[PDB]
Ligand SMILES: *[C@](=O)([N][C]C1=[C][C]=[C][C]=[C]1)C1=[C][C]=[C][C]=N1
């Protein structure tokens with residue numbers, strides 16, 4: 250047995266009783282619908298926030314949709330967060346991670362700009378990192394700010410790290426002051442004890458992970474697919490969080506360890522007794538509100554230290 | 559060239575111009591004086607604090623002197639810090655680290671109890687860890703508190719870890735809620751790039767480290783000498799700080815990385831451009847004030863989160 254919060258166990262039991270296909274039996278449009286419906290049933294609402302704006306920006310393969318959240322729009326220019334949603338590079342959009350983005354904006358008291366990057370299989374690897382890099386350079390070029398804070402969950406956690414590395418090697422007009430990968434993927438392989446322990450019955454399954462991987466068609470030798478295989482020296486101050494019952498946990502730990510070994514200031518949090526994907530499950534798993542708030546409090550402090558230096 | 563703050567370079571120019579014997583050419587009593595004089599010249603004063611009391615407590619080889627610092631002595635029962643000073647298990651006492659302990663008490667708003675543990679060579683390994691453990695159990699048995707926060711620099715950083723492991727395996731009457739090793743030693747060997755890079759001209763030298771190790775006479779296979787060689791699972795939330803130009807840096811990094819791999823919530827900070835020993839040099843190196851405040855602010859948060867849960 251592995252430690253599991255009671256409210257997590259209750260949500261897992263609920264999920265297991267539901268009838269309906271597995272995501273991996275569906276075509277991409279139906280998988281996409283399933284994540285939207287999941288958020289409607291099991292995530293909190295957006296809640297009160299002062300400004301939400303949608304717009305298009307130019308990208309290398311056409312327009313990239315973004316969404317700006319700000320709970321204090323008459324702020325002086327400060328750091329800005331660029332957020333990259335998860336969904337295994339196949340699913341997710343500006344609606345699935347809307348509640349979390351609005352919360353992030355409220356708690357951090359900075360603008361949050363979510364990227365609707367191109368998805369596989371219509372646009373396989375490396376469309377996602379190309380879009381994320383371009384949208385981030387665009388924010389630096391165009392949005393009133395002093396620095397960037399990159400963040401994202403799962404696939405988006407990969408995109409956080411990968412975009413951080415690209416901007417380390419070729420600076421944007423503004424520096425990345427901190428990153429916050431949330432239960433990130435950092436490699437393509439499954440040789441992890443956490444994958445063997447948690448790859449069934451904990452929402453993110455072996456089957457799902459195979460289906461995502463097949464659709465994305467990542468090149469395992471490319472830094473944008475496997476950042477754990479390339480030097481991490483000189484990256485920004487990192488807050489990396491894992492979920493203790495996630496198949497991705499061990500690689501998260503491994504990445505955080507690598508950062509430290511490279512001299513990168515690193516805060517590691519592990520959400521004990523909960524699962525992959527909690528940041529979009531805060532109504533179905535009430536304890537997720539605490540994991541969200543706790544992380545973002547810590548990030549706010551990381552950013553205040555950066556800003557007061 | 560390694561990044562060095564201007565004020566640190568200025569302090570090292572002073573240190574390198576000093577005449578007379580090097581610590582490692584001295585007997586213990588001469589090394590002990592050297593450190594006291596260093597603090598008088600280059601540390602800040604104790605400053606204003608509400609309560610400071612000395613007391614002798616029972617230990618397995620005789621009385622152990624301790625000193626309590628509290629800037630709010632009418633406090634409700636809350637956590638208490640137990641502090642183990644550094645000095646390579648040979649030098650240091652309650653006076654050498656007095657300014658830092660008073661500062662810690664002010665910033666953390668918790669009582670700090672420093673331990674005057676037995677020193678080598680009069681009392682070689684394992685007298686220090688025996689005393690530190692017994693004193694810590696005594697605080698838990700005798701002082702009004704809800705939990706312990708263990709902390710200490712260099713040798714004291716080893717003692718923090720080593721005492722935390724002992725209390726993990728056999729609980730004290732109160733839990734250890736967090737630890738704060740500062741530029742800790744975690745092994746006896748010198749096979750580290752940071753040792754080769756910084757073992758000359760940055761205060762803590764190959765010669766000083768050899769002299770300390772020879773007098774302490776630690777057993778390299780004992781967990782109390784080499785905690786990096788034993789499991790770290792189940793340790794408390796950890797704040798570990800290194801100094802970028804410290805010979806001990808890389809082992810500190812390695813230990814922080816080990817904690818993460820074991821699933822321990824870990825905050826890693828690296829004081830970039832400064833040296834081993836900075837927490838007692840806050841007048842000679844004015845930037846050390848910021849390293850001190852910055853770390854203690856973070857620790858205060860780690861503690862408020864533990865207490866709020
Ligand atoms: C990832 O993006 N997963 C996000 C997610 C999937 C299902 C439900 C909720 C969230 C991911 C998973 C595995 C490998 C890489 N990326």
Ligand SMILES: *[C@](=O)([N][C]C1=[C][C]=[C][C]=[C]1)C1=[C][C]=[C][C]=N1
Nearest residue numbers: 644645646712713714743767835
């Ligand atoms: C350590 O305690 N060093 C503390 C110190 C020594 C000299 C001056 C100022 C501070 C230490 C060093 C090396 C190994 C183990 N412990």
